[PDB]
Amino acid sequence: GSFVEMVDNLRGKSGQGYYVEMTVGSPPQTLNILVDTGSSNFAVGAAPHPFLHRYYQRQLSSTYRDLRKGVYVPYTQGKWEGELGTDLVSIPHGPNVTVRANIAAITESDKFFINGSNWEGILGLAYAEIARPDDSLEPFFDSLVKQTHVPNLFSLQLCGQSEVLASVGGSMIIGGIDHSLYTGSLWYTPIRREWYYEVIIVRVEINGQDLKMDCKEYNYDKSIVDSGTTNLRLPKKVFEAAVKSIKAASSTEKFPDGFWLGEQLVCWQAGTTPWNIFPVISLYLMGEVTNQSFRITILPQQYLRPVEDVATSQDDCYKFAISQSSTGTVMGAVIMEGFYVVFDRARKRIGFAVSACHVHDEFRTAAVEGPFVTLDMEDCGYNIPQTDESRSHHHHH
Ligand SMILES: CC1(C)Cc2ccccc2C(N[C@@H](Cc2ccccc2)C(=O)O)=N1
Ligand SMILES: [Zn+2]
Ligand SMILES: [Zn+2]
Ligand SMILES: [Zn+2]
The missing domain is CATH 2.40.70.10 (Acid Proteases)
Incomplete structure (x- = not known):
């Protein structure tokens, strides 16, 4: 993952943001993840939804660990909610590292996954202070940096x-x-x-x-x-x-x-x-x-x-x-x-x-x-x- 390997690693639809491929779990489950500098949770669809065709399946990941803690995130007009855990996470077209990150597996949501977006989850890149349920859930980028030399x-x-x-x-x-x-x-x-x-x-x-x-x-x-x-x-x-x-x-x-x-x-x-x-x-x-x-x-x-x-x-x-x-x-x-x-x-x-x-x-x-x-x-x-x-x-x- 040299910077030439990261050039062009985002796709999207006008008006529904930009996403990057990530993998979660072992063996790796590849998902399209919204890049979000306005939030601080890594959260992924983790159950069926009419506008998704893949989602994180925790039970097929030998490396998943359940944190036995729910999270619920209201928005102005929608919401997502789900179950916290940790798993191995990599960005196929990013740095050549694998990290153990927190993941919110979204079990229910409303007006969150839109018809045709093509992302299955969100990568909150902002700081711990605004993570849900509190600032003790380490955000992804903090785990990446703590665990590797990135x-x-x-x-x-x-x-x-x-x-x-x-x-x-x-x-x-x-x-x-x-x-x-x-x-x-x-x-x-x-x-x-x-x-x-x-x-x-x-x-x-x-x-x-x-x-x-x-x-x-x-x-x-x-x-x-x-x-x-x-x-x-x-x-x-x-x-x-x-x-x-x-x-x-x-x-x-x-x-x-x-x-x-x-x-x-x-x-x-x-x-x-x-x-x-x-x-x-x-x-x-x-x-x-x-x-x-x-x-x-x-x-x-x-x-x-x-x-x-x-x-x-x-x-x-x-x-x-x-x-x-x-x-x-x-x-x-x-x-x-x-x-x-x-x-x-x-x-x-x-x-x-x-x-x-x-x-x-x-x-x-x-x-x-x-x-x-x-x-x-x-x-x-x-x-x-x-x-x-x-x-x-x-x-x-
Ligand atoms: C997905 C995110 C980050 C948070 C959200 C949650 C619920 C409804 C709309 C939005 C929302 N609205 C965005 C539009 C959008 C951007 C990227 C992907 C999909 C829509 C906005 O309100 O500007 N942005
Ligand atoms: Zn790829
Ligand atoms: Zn605190
Ligand atoms: Zn105290």
Whole structure:
């Protein structure tokens, strides 16, 4: 598993994430596993489901050990639940190691496995703090690093039919950075706290124009990098200011309200989409150096996502892939697809460079540029109100 063996090891469907092959058990059971930087459990379908045709069969694994502990994970509209255990785990197209990891065998779920996704489980790559049922279930990547010599880093290159969804590809390089996957400078922003991959946005511009908000609004109540989310999601106030600005720029076109809520497509005749009327968006991330930031600039082709339907086929049609949040900013596939993203856990930082699989615009380029210096930079981080539950739990580690 040299970095050439890991290049191109991701597949997916537009809008249903990216997955990597993993094996579980002995003899090895091969499954397609969602790459999820927004969660911290390794959980696999482990019983029949109408939208799965394989699943982890614990009883066929001579190396499985039951942990005799359930786990139940609610989502906004779905859930998964299941039984904890440990087993041997390998990534066939990753580092040439086998590790004993925790595995949540999903016994029941609701609105979790979707018709046609092709993944059978999820690999939560974020930190122990957000693992369920608690921060004592070691996440996979922590086990990998503790048990082998793989460096404490991984990087993701997420690269951007008349009925069915577009096929996508990408690379997850485990333990390193492959310089063939990016061009230009690699810029790093600090990991603020090690729970989500949390970062701090200091400034936001839409077509070069500053939104002029209190910068804490940008990170209210956090900002995170999440391969498990499709859209760029923005806190309410920031989302309203952004929509106002993109509307202004594109006001040659009056779209319905449902378009701006992502609930309706807008279409132009084939090949005619006026890309020039939709503005670029720049997020400026706090730099490694005090008073410095750098920006990542996304093109309209990243945040307006094509969708082919049956009646709409003389036409190119698009969904607005920026949406309102009440749980802070989420830099999802919409942001990550422009970029090679380095999750440098050893150095508590995340790097961005322009990806080699570039998203194309006629006259503009998605970009990563810096530094930009601020006289008296000042703190853009939000401090989430400390609940009595968080406050009482003891962490004897
Ligand atoms: C799967 C995951 C990580 C967690 C989840 C759980 C339940 C419903 C939707 C989602 C969800 N929604 C994503 C969309 C998506 C991404 C990757 C695969 C499938 C859908 C989102 O809400 O942006 N993401
Ligand atoms: Zn394979
Ligand atoms: Zn105690
Ligand atoms: Zn703890």
